[PDB]
Ligand binder design. Structure first.
Ligand SMILES: [Ca+2]
Ligand SMILES: [Ca+2]
Ligand SMILES: [Ca+2]
Ligand SMILES: [Ca+2]
Length: 327
C-alpha cells in the first residue's frame, strides 16, 4: 500500500497521495478509478484518482467532464468527499463537495446556488494565504460547490459547476487536475471508493446526432463519383479521392460513424481528417454496408473541414460511402 507522498498513474488514472507531517495514512490502488484509504490523526491528507492535464487547455477545450462514483465513507472528524483539482493562471484550488465529516465546508456566505445531479449546491469563494500548492507555498483562491445534504454515490456534472462558477465571476485558468478525492483535516477515517469513472467528451444518447450524406459533400480527387448501389452515396476509387465538408463543432469531442462498404471481399480503408490533421481510419471489411465508429475524437470547438479520403488504394478495392454521422 501507499503510505508516503507519491504521484503516479494506475490503471489509466492519475493518482496522488499527499499528507503533511503528523499522523499516518494508507492508500490502496484498485482497478479503474477506485481505491481505498485510511488515515489516523493527520494534520492534512488527500487521497485522489483522476486526470492530470498539461496546463495548456481550458476546461471548454478539454470538453464536457462528468464523474460517476460510489464510496463507503467513514470519516471521524473533519473530512471531505469531493471532486477536487487545480487551475493555473490563475492558480485556483477547487472542490465539488458531496459529503463531509463533522463540518460542512467552507464557511462564509454563499455567492449563489446550482441545482444539478438531483441536489442543491451552494457556491463559495475563499482565500488561502501562504499555503501549500502545486506551485509551492502560495496565496490563491479556492472555489467550492457544496451540497446542502450528504451523499456518497451518484454523478457529478463537473463542467456544470465550472460554468456556474464562471457565471458568477469566478474565473478559471487552464486545467491542471480533476479527481475524486478523500480529504482529512485534523482527523482520522477510512473510505472505500468502489466506483469512480471520469468521462471526458461523451454525454446523453439523445442530445442529437448530425447525419451528413456522402453524396451531398464536396468531391475531390481524380475519380470520386456518385453511386446508387449498394446505397445512395459516393465511390472513392484512387488515392486522393475524397469527400469533404465544413462542420460546425459545438463541443470539443465527437464520435464519427461512417456507413460504407468495400466493393468486394477485400478490406477498404478510409482516412478521417479534421482541420487538415489525420484523426483516424475507418475499416470496411467486405462488400456489405456497415457502420464503422471512431469514438472519443478531441478536435476542439469551431468550424473545421471534415475530409474522408482514400490514401492506401492499390487497385484491389474501392471505397463506397453512404453517410457520416457526428455525435
Ligand atoms: Ca488541503
Ligand atoms: Ca491534531
Ligand atoms: Ca480502388
Ligand atoms: Ca448517402
Amino acid at each position: 500500500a501507499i503510505t508516503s507522498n507519491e504521484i503516479g498513474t494506475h490503471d489509466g488514472y492519475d493518482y496522488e497521495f499527499w499528507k503533511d507531517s503528523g499522523g499516518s495514512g494508507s492508500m490502496t490502488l484498485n482497478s479503474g478509478g477506485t481505491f481505498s484509504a485510511q488515515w489516523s490523526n493527520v494534520n492534512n491528507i488527500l487521497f485522489r484518482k483522476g486526470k492530470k492535464f498539461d496546463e495548456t487547455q481550458t476546461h471548454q477545450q478539454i470538453g464536457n467532464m462528468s464523474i460517476n462514483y460510489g464510496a463507503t465513507y467513514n470519516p471521524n472528524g473533519n473530512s471531505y468527499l469531493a471532486v477536487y483539482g487545480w487551475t493555473v493562471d490563475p492558480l485556483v484550488e477547487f472542490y465539488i463537495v458531496d459529503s463531509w465529516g463533522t463540518w460542512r465546508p467552507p464557511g462564509g456566505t454563499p455567492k449563489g446556488t446550482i441545482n444539478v445531479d438531483g441536489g442543491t449546491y451552494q457556491i463559495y469563494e475563499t482565500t488561502r494565504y501562504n499555503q501549500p500548492s502545486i506551485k509551492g507555498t502560495a496565496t490563491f483562491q479556492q472555489y467550492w460547490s457544496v451540497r446542502t445534504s450528504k451523499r456518497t454515490s451518484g454523478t457529478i456534472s463537473v463542467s456544470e459547476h465550472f460554468r456556474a462558477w464562471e457565471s458568477l465571476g469566478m474565473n478559471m485558468g487552464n486545467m491542471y487536475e480533476v479527481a475524486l478525492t478523500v480529504e482529512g483535516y485534523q482527523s482520522s477515517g477510512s473510505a472505500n471508493v468502489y466506483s469512480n469513472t471520469l468521462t471526458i467528451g461523451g454525454q446523453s444518447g439523445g442530445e442529437q446526432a448530425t447525419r451528413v450524406e456522402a453524396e451531398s459533400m464536396t468531391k475531390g480527387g481524380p475519380y470520386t463519383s456518385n453511386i446508387t448501389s449498394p446505397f445512395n452515396g459516393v465511390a472513392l476509387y484512387a488515392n486522393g479521392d475524397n469527400v469533404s465538408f465544413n462542420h460546425s463543432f459545438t463541443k470539443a469531442n465527437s464520435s464519427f460513424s461512417l456507413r460504407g462498404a468495400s466493393n468486394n471481399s477485400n478490406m477498404a480503408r478510409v482516412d478521417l481528417r479534421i482541420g487538415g490533421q489525420n484523426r483516424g481510419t475507418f475499416y470496411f471489411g467486405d462488400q456489405y454496408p456497415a457502420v464503422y465508429t471512431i469514438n472519443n475524437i478531441n478536435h476542439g470547438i469551431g468550424n473545421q473541414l471534415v475530409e474522408l479520403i482514400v490514401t492506401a488504394d492499390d487497385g484491389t478495392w474501392d471505397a463506397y460511402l453512404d453517410y457520416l454521422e457526428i455525435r
